Amino acid sequence: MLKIIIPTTMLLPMTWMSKHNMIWINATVHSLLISLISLSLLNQLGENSLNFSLTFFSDSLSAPLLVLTTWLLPLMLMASQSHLSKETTTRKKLYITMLILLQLFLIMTFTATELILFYILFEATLVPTLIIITRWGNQTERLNAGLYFLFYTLAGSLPLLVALVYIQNTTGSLNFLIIHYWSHPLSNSWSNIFMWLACIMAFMVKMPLYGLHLWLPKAHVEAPIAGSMVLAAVLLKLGGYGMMRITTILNPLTNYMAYPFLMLSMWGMIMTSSICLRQTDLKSLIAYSSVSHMALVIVAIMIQTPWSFMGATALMIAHGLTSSMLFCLANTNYERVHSRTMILARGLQTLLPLMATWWLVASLTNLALPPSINLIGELFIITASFSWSNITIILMGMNMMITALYSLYMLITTQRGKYTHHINNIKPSFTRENALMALHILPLLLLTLNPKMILGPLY
Amino acid sequence: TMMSGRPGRVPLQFLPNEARSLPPPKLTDPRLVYMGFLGYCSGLIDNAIRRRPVVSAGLHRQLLYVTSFVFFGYYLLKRQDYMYALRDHDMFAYVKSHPEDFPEKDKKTYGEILEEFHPVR
Amino acid sequence: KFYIREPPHGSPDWLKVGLTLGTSVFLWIYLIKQHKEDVLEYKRRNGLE
Amino acid sequence: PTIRLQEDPDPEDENLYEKNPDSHGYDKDPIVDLWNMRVVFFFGFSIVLVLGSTFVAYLPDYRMQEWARREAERLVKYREANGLPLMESNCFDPNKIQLPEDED
Amino acid sequence: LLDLIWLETILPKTTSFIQMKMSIMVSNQKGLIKLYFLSFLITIMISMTLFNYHE
Amino acid sequence: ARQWQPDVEWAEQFGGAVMYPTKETAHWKPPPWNDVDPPKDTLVSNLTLNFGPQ
Amino acid sequence: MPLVYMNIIMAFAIALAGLLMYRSHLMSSLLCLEGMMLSLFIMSTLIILNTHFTLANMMPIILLVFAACEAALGLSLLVMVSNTYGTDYVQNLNLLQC
Amino acid sequence: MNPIIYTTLIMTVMSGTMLVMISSHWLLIWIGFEMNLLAMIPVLMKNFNPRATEAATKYFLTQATASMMLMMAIIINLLYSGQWTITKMFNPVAMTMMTMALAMKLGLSPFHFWVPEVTQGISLQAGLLLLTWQKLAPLSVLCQISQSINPNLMLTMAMLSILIGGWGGLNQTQLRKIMAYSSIAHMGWMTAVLPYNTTMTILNLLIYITMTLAMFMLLIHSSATTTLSLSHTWNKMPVITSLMMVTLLSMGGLPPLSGFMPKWMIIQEMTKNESIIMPTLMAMTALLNLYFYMRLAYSSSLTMFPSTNNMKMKWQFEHTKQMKLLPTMIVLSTLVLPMTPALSSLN
Amino acid sequence: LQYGPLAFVLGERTTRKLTETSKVITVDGNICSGKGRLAREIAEKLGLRHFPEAGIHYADSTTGDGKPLDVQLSGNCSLEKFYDDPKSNDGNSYRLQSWLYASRLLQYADALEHLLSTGQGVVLERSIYSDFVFLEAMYRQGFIRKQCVEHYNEVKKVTACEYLPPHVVVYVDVPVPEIQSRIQKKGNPHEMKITAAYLQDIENAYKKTFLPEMSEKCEVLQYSAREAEDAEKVVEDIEYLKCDKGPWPDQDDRTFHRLRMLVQNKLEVLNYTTIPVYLPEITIGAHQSDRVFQKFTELPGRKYSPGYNEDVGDKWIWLK
């Protein structure tokens, strides 16, 4: 699959040799071409993976993630080129380089065939993101946000490295195929309990689990728009991919281990969905929405049923798209009014109608309206949980009610009512913003047309 | 430690005579290409630090950087391959000379081995 | 223009350019010859060709 | 000086619609702006979106699901034509399985 | 109560406080070699009677 | 509108003798810009000798 | 092991402790260092004399030579410290505290 | 100092280190250490001031005491076995004495106190020399006798060094003290794997020396010795600060950078043994070093600090003498992880 | 071969090019004195090199093309605005004072480099040793604050201690009424606003501090207004001096090697001028710093090194 990896490494010097006023055009065009190329990975087999070489492979869980990454890069390029207009050409090329390196690391991450290479790229993704946040953020809290983001990740991921090298020393290999075919049960031991914790906690922190989720509001609120897009769309799904890969070795230990994580995920689902009801900041509301959805994905991965895994894959894809669109929609208003307070700019449907319908469709997909892929994934997870325990429906049911509540609350607060009288600098929506919204939203509907492409290997 | 003392080893050779019975790394070896890339990056950083046009300032010195890195990398790769070949040779010889420590166990089929089943529910 | 004429010449320092290119060419030729000799020696030892 | 710095004042926002009433919000130069709009629309909506969706809709059935249906039809036909249970609870033939001789 | 206070208190704020306290304790030395070499003597005595006795 | 960048008040917290000023190290002073402390004007004490009369 | 070996090793330990403990004057610490050289010389000579190793009879000479090198180094440093402060007190050597 | 005398002193330092490395006799190794110290003392005092005199005196006292202990260990080993060859160290008391002597020569905790003071009191060139070249000989001797080394004592000192370097580095505003504390932590990382595999020790040594050379050469290029003096560099040399930030990230140990490779190999080698807890603690403690590296990166490259008016005059002048191999050290300090298997040419 | 350790180990010494006529000379006088013409006459009679007094754009003349740059890109201060509004709250007074001190330090380094490289002597129209008189004049008149004086003193303490004082100190003494009359006869509108107390403070500083301090280490030759015109007398007075009291007779080849390594590398000379002391008058915010620095690199021959700027006519770049 070097036919996708090498064009990105070629995006690098093409950007660094493009003339000063053609960087955005070249980057967008060739990133769109690269996404078109990567779209060919969706032709998956039904029994085994696509083993390209000794180091790279692809199944139907990683192909939609790769397509999502390659599609997200041009969207971030379009969203970034507005707030970087006054920026010097060299640092604009540096920003584009950061985005390209992030894409390359993500692309190699989803297809690395042994656990150590996956770990190396999984953690290499931290450097471009940190540089983006702490160099191109706007406020003074970006430094502390970057510190939280870095150290939460590393604290949970270093024990993963120790566990991985221990596992290879004991079993002889870390290639995923060999690990799956030669898998053996884990005994009920303290050593095994701590090896389970070391294997699981890094991905819990990345999801994030409700407990260790504090870094996420700081990182997503202080980041520039492209940073927020990549954090919400792809970087949260690294933990889900890692769990769905590493879990095969962990069983049968997971049955008595997953209890605290399941309880944390469900109750924190309720808690973080309730937090969105009293959020005075829009970006923080979207961030806590992401936390609750990813808690649902954690429950799905933990209970380990085929329907669970299909729902988790669908929910990961759907949430990536929806959260990216919501962040872009919020950033449009932010660039209008230079403040993130929700109640500052009100009644925007009167002044920005098409942007108002973009808001409506984003909010509708956020609260899992049928037959969107959001609800497909959520309902599959809910059915799997009901099979796991019939009492889960109460918690699941409560979450659905609060999710619809804060989604429509955000829509009503920002779009309806009467426009604030003092603000007179609300210009008509640009073609760039409307195109960006359309390019987020059209793939969601086209995907609900053909939903088997994002349902994972268990399909 | 482990490889420091070995019989019949010249102290500062860096490339024993027995290493010539191994296939040399190809000149298009990806590791050599990475060494050349490292040389190119060193040349570019040299241009940037000295406040010169990064891509085009000194072509002769950039070429010297690239060829120096490739030249060192070729012998580095040869020595790497030789040491790994020695490791495998010694391990195989030790396995062969100590049969009782590496015995071939009986082959069992999955129809005979009884693995406990853990239901997922 | 420059007030003083920037001791690194406005033309290339032909001596340094000369020996830099010379050592690059020499290194490349030596590496090619070493590779050919290694290939022949390896084929001679192992009974291939 | 009653100040702390020799710092530039914060500049005000530059409205793109002022110098270009039809500005597309891509760049300040109208020509580069128009061409950025055109390339985004053509390579996003025309090439990747429509042609990619068409390519995805006509992907060959490598998932082997019509094949599975045909195989199921053949086995059901054969088994019902011979008075067979149409599916057995043993995934593998018990004869090729050697259970432990005793558990007492 | 939970996010802005207690979840902050337990993992990151406790870590920062403990690391800052340990940094202040370790770094703030008087700069005098008298105390340093007294510490060296204590360390040497401990090593001889602990690690060394158990051969 | 513009991105926030550190000011004098922000930069002066990295200009002390150490990070985390405390009660004990509050009276420490940062070393001289060039690492040359002023010469301590040590009073020289010559030997005073009675040479004679005896 | 003989008892004279105990006495020499105790002399070395006493000199090491005396060096480790600092009072005021630097000079006394250099005295302790030179005493440690003296004890090492005596121990080496006794061991070398007892088992008839002929070729090591020269190493105490080299030990004394490098002992003198250390002594000269310490004296030069003490000269410079006293020139800076007027006394050889170790309390003055505290500029690198901050 | 006369250039001829300075060159002679530097070559005497290097010849003492080489004599330590090429000698099979204990007396000759001791003589190499003594020659190294004798020529090393004036180099610290090349630029004369009270602080340089203090650093020279403290360094001399520490190294002289270490030489005392090393000679005593040699003599005890001779007494209990008439052997002059550097080998298994037949006596355990002599082995403990030798281990503490070499650890105090290296600066391993609890003997770490001298290093921050001596590094701060000397110039950046002498600090570079002290923190790179002066570690080779004690580490070579420790490598040669690692079979008889006691795991309990060496691992205790290594863990103490990592903890103390991480903690002490957090409190520091001066750059030389930060480099000294990072040196102590890296020394602990090097000596933790010493009883298990000396090839990993040599690999960590080479990577650390490359990163340290890059960092000192960057700090010499931009004449900065404090945090705020380095906060000015972006207004004169932005490329230097960007390279410094990447080098700092590499120093922290984050992948895919060169710095990550030594810890990754050491952890793997320790887990080939049982040794599970200690590598975990080592990584969680190296997090502190990463933290204060990031503090430096925030102050120097990822934000823009206020400048002064006189920098406009510096804008018109070039860097007169350019240090060779700065570009090479930066590249080797960042982009060398894919060449990791080449460590097999080290054993 | 650029001068360095290698050129010192083999061959080059500088006491074999000092020919007893070097005699670094600095001429000092109160504003609007005939010191410039006296210095020019002294230089052309003695065969020395004359250094015109360092102004705001002195560094511009030694870099790139000798043409001055914009005030916003170099200096960021004007002398005219100091004469118009010496108490303006933008900090122009002390900013100008510190920029002038840095310019004088650079000029002293250049003069010393020329002296130690060719042996030829130099004549200076002022020095870093006498720049403090304007500082004290501003401070006594309330133009600047005490913190500015402390910052100046720190920079001067860490910078001026590394150089050698001039051999001969020439002072042109012209009383305050006469210099006021000369300013009135000048024609410049801006200067005419100099209060007499300012010139009195400058004169007081020169007589009380500069000359007494320079007396212990230099040859001080005071003159009067009428003695300055006949420069032959001054030159033959300089020819019959005994340079015996300063630190110059105590200088070896190693001290000269150190000083010659210091006088080149102007970045090392200017190192301690930009110490991180945050005075509001001279501290520049991040945004303005970035903007002005970006503007500086947009200049015709300032983006790259002095040999690699294509847009000023440098060819063969790819082969350098």
Ligand SMILES: CCCCCCCCCCCCCCCCCC(=O)OC[C@H](COP(=O)([O-])OCC(O)COP(=O)([O-])OC[C@@H](COC(=O)CCCCCCCCCCCCCCCCC)OC(=O)CCCCCCCCCCCCCCCCC)OC(=O)CCCCCCCCCCCCCCCCC
């Ligand atoms: C994994 C896949 C591959 C990835 C490998 C890693 C990345 C690539 C290699 C990296 C090293 C290579 C270059 C390093 C030296 C360059 C330094 C530099 O500044 O460049 C300026 C230079 C432009 O300057 P200029 O033109 O001379 O004039 C403008 C002035 O110089 C303007 O001068 P200025 O003074 O105004 O500049 C000021 C600016 C200058 O500051 C900088 O430019 C930053 C310098 C980069 C640091 C590099 C450190 C070492 C590399 C480590 C990389 C880490 C990767 C791992 C991921 C973590 C990311 C950190 O500083 C700032 O403004 C502050 C911004 C702070 C941001 C902090 C982030 C910085 C670190 C990020 C590094 C990430 C990699 C960047 C790679 C490219 C960067 C140029 O850039 C280039 O032109 C070179 C780009 C590459 C050239 C390749 C072209 C070859 C031919 C093309 C065709 C290809 C083959 C053809 C055949 C096909 C058949 C047809």
Ligand SMILES: CCCCCCCCCCCCCCCCC[C@@H](O)O[C@H](CO[C@H](O)CCCCCCCCCCCCCCC)COP(=O)(O)OCC[N+](C)(C)C
């Ligand atoms: C903020 C969010 C953080 C993330 C939260 C992650 C939660 C991780 C918790 C892991 C759950 C399982 C760990 C222990 C397994 C068994 C539970 C315990 O009760 O053991 C009992 C045993 O009784 C006692 O509880 C033994 C453990 C006593 C010590 C544990 C106390 C720890 C206090 C909790 C601290 C909070 C955790 C967070 C730390 C920062 C069971 O009896 P037994 O069947 O015989 O033993 C089964 C295990 N065997 C078979 C291997 C032996």
Ligand SMILES: CCCCCCCCCCCCCCCCC[C@@H](O)O[C@H](CO[C@H](O)CCCCCCCCCCCCCCC)COP(=O)(O)OCC[N+](C)(C)C
């Ligand atoms: C960032 C990487 C840092 C690299 C450091 C500098 C890189 C260049 C190294 C300079 C090359 C010349 C050194 C030696 C050449 C000829 C001398 C020859 O005799 O050396 C022999 C063999 O050569 C050297 O031993 C090996 C040098 C190889 C260095 C490169 C390995 C780098 C580690 C992996 C990182 C990847 C780097 C990729 C290139 C940048 C010594 O054999 P031996 O007497 O028995 O060893 C005694 C000590 N032992 C046994 C304990 C080892």
Ligand SMILES: CCCCCCCCCCCCCCCCC[C@@H](O)O[C@H](CO[C@H](O)CCCCCCCCCCCCCCC)COP(=O)(O)OCC[N+](C)(C)C
């Ligand atoms: C502004 C005006 C609005 C109102 C006017 C609207 C105009 C008319 C629109 C109304 C018509 C409704 C459509 C009716 C459905 C017909 C389409 C259907 O037949 O196609 C589906 C097929 O859907 C496609 O598969 C959709 C492709 C999915 C999108 C591809 C992704 C594009 C790349 C963008 C990046 C996305 C990244 C996220 C991760 C993937 C059926 O699936 P399938 O039965 O099997 O295929 C049939 C062909 N076979 C039989 C040969 C197999």
Ligand SMILES: CCCCCCCC/C=C\CCCCCCCC(=O)O[C@H](COC(=O)CCCCCCC/C=C/CCCCCCCC)COP(=O)(O)OCCN
């Ligand atoms: C955002 C913050 C998150 C931080 C989470 C970090 C902690 C993750 C959980 C523990 C990680 C450390 C596990 C160690 C690596 C696993 C390797 C392993 O399992 O192998 C075991 C080794 O098991 C161990 O040694 C485990 C020792 C644990 C010591 C480290 C203490 C860490 C703190 C413990 C409690 C906290 C952990 C949970 C906290 C969750 C986060 C709140 C078997 O080795 P043997 O010695 O050969 O035994 C069998 C042969 N006789």
Ligand SMILES: Nc1ncnc2c1ncn2[C@@H]1O[C@H](COP(=O)(O)OP(=O)(O)O)[C@@H](O)[C@H]1O
């Ligand atoms: N350190 C300083 N501070 C303020 N003004 C100064 C300083 N140095 C020189 N000047 C001004 O520069 C101008 C020229 O000085 P001067 O030599 O007296 O005139 P001329 O060149 O005609 O002889 C004068 O107006 C003087 O005030």
